[PDB]
Amino acid sequence: TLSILVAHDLQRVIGFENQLPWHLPNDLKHVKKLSTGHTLVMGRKTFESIGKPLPNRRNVVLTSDTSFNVEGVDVIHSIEDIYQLPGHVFIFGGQTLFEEMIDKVDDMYITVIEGKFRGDTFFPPYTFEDWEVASSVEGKLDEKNTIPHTFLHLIRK
Numbered sequence: 001t002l003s004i005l006v007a008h009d010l011q012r013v014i015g016f017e018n019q020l021p022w023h024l025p026n027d028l029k030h031v032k033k034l035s036t037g038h039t040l041v042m043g044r045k046t047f048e049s050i051g052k053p054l055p056n057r058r059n060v061v062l063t064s065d066t067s068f069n070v071e072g073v074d075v076i077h078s079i080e081d082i083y084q085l086p087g088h089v090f091i092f093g094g095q096t097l098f099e100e101m102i103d104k105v106d107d108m109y110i111t112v113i114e115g116k117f118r119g120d121t122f123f124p125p126y127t128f129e130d131w132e133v134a135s136s137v138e139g140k141l142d143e144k145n146t147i148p149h150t151f152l153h154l155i156r157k
């Protein structure tokens, strides 16, 4: 199973100056439940922006740097190596790798942030004519989650 896993705002912003533009604890928990025990694949810049591999799952970084090495991180140098990864594989970021993978994945787990943030990194355009809405769940607002958001699982028609 090959999935995209992304949070993006109303204009598909996913990042600003190496940071997430929003603070949404419920989405981090969403990320944890989906991807714990499985595989996250990310381009080099997305990994560096995070700074450490995420615990309790395989962390795979795509880069052309043959000296890249980080404890707890498996390195690949080719898009085609993604297809040899066993198990459930989530494409995690960033804009470049999403552009390379959006036409290849089976499904996408999107968190739509119902806001307009300043961004410099974007998720590719996509149309619902190509994706069936398997589920759409509104996140709950509270104390620490103050931006409306929606969990979409989209599956390729």
Ligand SMILES: NC(=O)C1=CN([C@H]2O[C@H](COP(=O)(O)OP(=O)(O)OC[C@H]3O[C@@H](n4cnc5c(N)ncnc54)[C@H](OP(=O)(O)O)[C@@H]3O)[C@@H](O)[C@H]2O)C=CC1
Residues within 6 Å of the ligand: 014, 015, 016, 017, 018, 019, 020, 042, 043, 044, 045, 046, 047, 049, 062, 063, 064, 065, 077, 078, 079, 092, 093, 094, 095, 096, 097, 098, 100, 121
């Ligand atoms: N929500 C998110 O995902 C967030 C992520 N970002 C990041 O995304 C922003 C935009 O950068 P980006 O390019 O989208 O990030 P990215 O896609 O995570 O990193 C791109 C890098 O991945 C490597 N790469 C990609 N395709 C490859 C291929 N076919 N073969 C070999 N290596 C390949 C290469 O690393 P190289 O070979 O150069 O070492 C390239 O420069 C950056 O400012 C980051 O901070 C921003 C903040 C939040």
Ligand SMILES: CCc1nc(N)nc(N)c1C#C[C@H](C)c1cc(OC)cc(-c2ccncc2)c1
Residues within 6 Å of the ligand: 005, 006, 007, 018, 019, 020, 027, 028, 030, 031, 046, 049, 050, 054, 091, 092, 093, 109, 110, 111
């Ligand atoms: C969660 C946000 C998020 N949600 C969803 N549904 N999919 C995603 N692909 C990401 C994401 C992301 C990027 C890689 C990111 C950037 C970052 O820049 C600091 C910190 C984190 C991060 C810090 C702590 N724990 C998990 C992830 C993630």
